[PDB]
Amino acid sequence: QALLRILKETEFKKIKVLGSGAFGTVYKGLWIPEGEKVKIPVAIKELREATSPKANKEILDEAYVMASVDNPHVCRLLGICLTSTVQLIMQLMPFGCLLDYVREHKDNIGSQYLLNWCVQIAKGMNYLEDRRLVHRDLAARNVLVKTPQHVKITDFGLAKLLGAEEKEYHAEGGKVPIKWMALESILHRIYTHQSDVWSYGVTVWELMTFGSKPYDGIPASEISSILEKGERLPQPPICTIDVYMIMRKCWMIDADSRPKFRELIIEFSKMARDPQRYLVIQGDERMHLPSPTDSNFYRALMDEEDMDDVVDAD
Amino acid sequence: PNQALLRILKETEFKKIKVLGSGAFGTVYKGLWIPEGEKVKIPVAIKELREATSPKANKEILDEAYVMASVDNPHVCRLLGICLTSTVQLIMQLMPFGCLLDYVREHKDNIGSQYLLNWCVQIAKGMNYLEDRRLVHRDLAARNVLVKTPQHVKITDFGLAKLLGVPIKWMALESILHRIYTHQSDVWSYGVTVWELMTFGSKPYDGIPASEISSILEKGERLPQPPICTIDVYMIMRKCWMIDADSRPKFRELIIEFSKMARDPQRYLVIQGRMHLPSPTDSNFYRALMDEEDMDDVVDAD
């Protein structure tokens, strides 16, 4: 209750469209505290309608859980406004989502960065599992970039709260992430922490291919059919077999045979200490992590919260 | 000092966008920092300093900026970056609320007692840190206290007066007569700063010529008791304005006294009607959006 602020329409205004997604439309907004004349920039996500007749109460009940997460790699829901539409408010991060970032820096992202992103994403998911929360829609598009050295997972639980209409699960490119889903989730709508591990594997594939679309050209209606016959996402050219084997274990049919998020943290952090042994990238060396000076600059301006330190090289 | 705490910016990676204000030390701009290889523009605050009385060496300007970048305290502004061209430009975090002097004036009819007493607590905490680092401000005033949130203020521009080279009505008498600047003379200006807050931004010795302040202090005259101040508050202010600098209070004793008074604020400030400190919900909203650095909890009422 003390973690979630209930906003009124009178104290915030949408001032710029930022993008649209499977869950709603993102705006750059301004919050005016009562009695003040300043405008604080915020981020606002106006959600699509739900398929269920959800009352406000329990919409607020899931928002209370969204506002209760405390981890450097999980987005905390800061505020909510229940008007005609449901509007979620969080801190504005000028870098956007990680999927767009790797697409904008495809020839300039080094190994140290890619491996550290996989560590931080697994750290966030491991926290969500500790909170016994299942994301259901983990993907690079749902990873937000606070700084290039600090990423955070967002939109956990929005898939279960909003839901998706039955026709989308059998349509092409709908509000259903078929190409990120575990097979048990496609066949029987079973969502666990272990199906999150599957989507984590696809998310890592997204980063290592610098934002390539998974199963591109393959119809979503045939994904369960090709997965049943043993076909998986191909090995990215920069990935050694050690990295590719990790991805393949998250896509195992037996959900309990997939790795745990706490074991994914350990394995990727060991690889981050010696990044050029596990990722082969052209000119990888001159793609350093930032100096102490510049990160101290990044942190003082944009990231005054504390996080783990990014895993350094040998 | 770790040189790693001061980033030297170049003109191409930052550009001024809007004037925010002017002072005796320079002009304040709202700026945007564009990181190299980044398509983002981060809002910053930029202070371009005016010409120094006597022209200092570039090493010295750079040597003192390293000290300004070395302070680590929730109530002292840390210098984040500098750009040394023809002019000197200082870069710090952008704070949308501005200075405490304008804030207390704009809320002349809205300010509650817990804000005023806690602001005094925080200013003394910032000054005590500067005293611990043996840095002398020389120009502590309400205009030089910045508002990050209404519950969080920070001191700025320490040492700029000595680098650039006159607030007569904020200075201790030893500073007027002989230009003696100590942590003790900073205590004098702290009292005037508190008097500013308790009068909601009133000008000290308004209508009195600055050239006559030296005589008015020597005959024992001081700033009057603010209408909302009980004598406990006013006695603290008068003790910082004692002629004997060694008899003035120390910043560590000002922290304790104002924190005691903040625990029962309406027993020490008599205000007609203002607004209390924010809920836990509104406090974490302010901080999750705007203020994520480490602070001690603001002193609440018993």
Ligand SMILES: CSc1nc(-c2cccc(NC(=O)c3cc(O)ccc3F)c2)c(-c2ccnc(NC(C)=O)c2)[nH]1
């Ligand atoms: C790529 S999609 C996207 N959505 C968002 C967004 C916006 C507002 C709120 C939320 N979410 C939650 O509040 C929430 C939901 C839950 O279920 C669990 C927990 C929660 F906290 C998300 C962004 C985003 C956020 C901030 N700044 C930017 N900046 C730029 C340049 O785009 C974008 N981007």
Ligand SMILES: CSc1nc(-c2cccc(NC(=O)c3cc(O)ccc3F)c2)c(-c2ccnc(NC(C)=O)c2)[nH]1
């Ligand atoms: C007194 S007027 C004023 N100056 C500044 C300012 C701006 C940039 C740099 C500095 N200087 C220092 O940071 C510095 C100086 C030192 O010597 C020691 C250590 C230091 F950190 C100051 C502001 C200010 C700052 C941020 N946001 C706002 N927002 C609004 C709405 O006005 C204003 N206001």
Ligand SMILES: [Cl-]
């Ligand atoms: Cl100034």
